[PDB]
Here is the input.
Amino acid sequence: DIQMTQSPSSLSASLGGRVTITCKASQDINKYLAWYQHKPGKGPRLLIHYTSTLQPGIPSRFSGSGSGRDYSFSISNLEPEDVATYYCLQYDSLLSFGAGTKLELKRADAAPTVSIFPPSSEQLTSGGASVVCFLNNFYPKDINVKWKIDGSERQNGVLNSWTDQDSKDSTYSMSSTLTLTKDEYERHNSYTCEATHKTSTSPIVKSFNRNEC
Amino acid sequence: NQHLCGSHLVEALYLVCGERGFFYTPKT
Amino acid sequence: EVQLVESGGGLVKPGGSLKLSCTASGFAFSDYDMSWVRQTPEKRLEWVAFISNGGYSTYYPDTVKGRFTISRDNAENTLYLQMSSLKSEDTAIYYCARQGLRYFDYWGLGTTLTVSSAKTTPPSVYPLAPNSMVTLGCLVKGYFPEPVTVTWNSGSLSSGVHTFPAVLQSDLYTLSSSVTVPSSTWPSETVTCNVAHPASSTKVDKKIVPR
Amino acid sequence: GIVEQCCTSICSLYQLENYCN
Here is the structure.
């Protein structure tokens, strides 16, 4: 059971382009290395065995090479269905997997569309107050979110979550939720989420108070 | 520790594979 | 065509038991060694159990050896994994995989296992209301376990839509879903989030009302 | 597996080698 170090963890590539992944074994594995493609909601699919032998039916734009401890996997002419997580497997000594490489699509930088939402009738009638904010359809992946209430920032009681690359526009999205007991909602008036992206000096600011559009 | 297989399978694997041992599925 | 279909996944309390099944078709099942492999929430693939084609030989990693038992019924083209004394680190998607040679060459689509002491809880579903386009959504709060499904207008709305991954804490899940529709057709024309939580036998429809 | 293949019959030394770690 040998250690495989796969790198990089993630890549961005453009349609028609070309990508390369490496696997390094902790000891010589005698070219017994296979490569798998794994898409969300399906089972893995075998691409290559014995370092470079294509599985029948697999397009020729996939290839592999290496010997001893050092191996690589490549895609020529990247097609949109090639977006997936790729894994290596050594099978010289028992069997062991690499950690994986998430392959995503390159795209033109785009700013988030930001939308503010106050808590609803349902929630306050039940003892809670949740304010939510969406940062939708932006690129690249990384963004930051700061919540502002009564002119000052609040940084506790907030959890955030990221979409994967949207398969529709190659953009990402992010959701930010600040959740309070329902009696610090009616305490204050002013609530603000600002989204800072590499696409702009100044953050995109959305806010509401005691009557909402 | 007697053997199970008429072919002396376990003892023959010690000779071929030594001390790295064997697995039940061949690699080629 | 070669087909592998896993089944039997579900939610089990720590220390519990559960038997997974895998149905084979499209090839001579009794000629093939078979394994179970799992994908953990951190997206690592983990070899879990192995059995040779005639069932003579078996192998388990130390992380599961003694608690899991793999077995097969060649006349019924079925592979099984009996798990027992289950722990939270066992939570994963479990796959069936064929080994003509030592590398795997076909996989099933998977069956999901969750090991948790948390109690099954239905969600609270809250509307989210705030230009030539409007962005609405719904908040799905305080549920267990995964998954929930969210559709808009009975699935009839379908591009302003994407749903964010649930976040766990204080042993309940929360997620939200977003919808973008032409400002002309809302609030002129109603938009409703349909939410379904199969484990608690819940379906809920929440109308999005303006201000 | 190896028990189904090399237990009733003698397997070559090349064949046994393919089962090693």
Observations:
- Chain C is about 0% helix and 50% strand.
- The two ends of chain C are 56 Å apart (CA to CA).
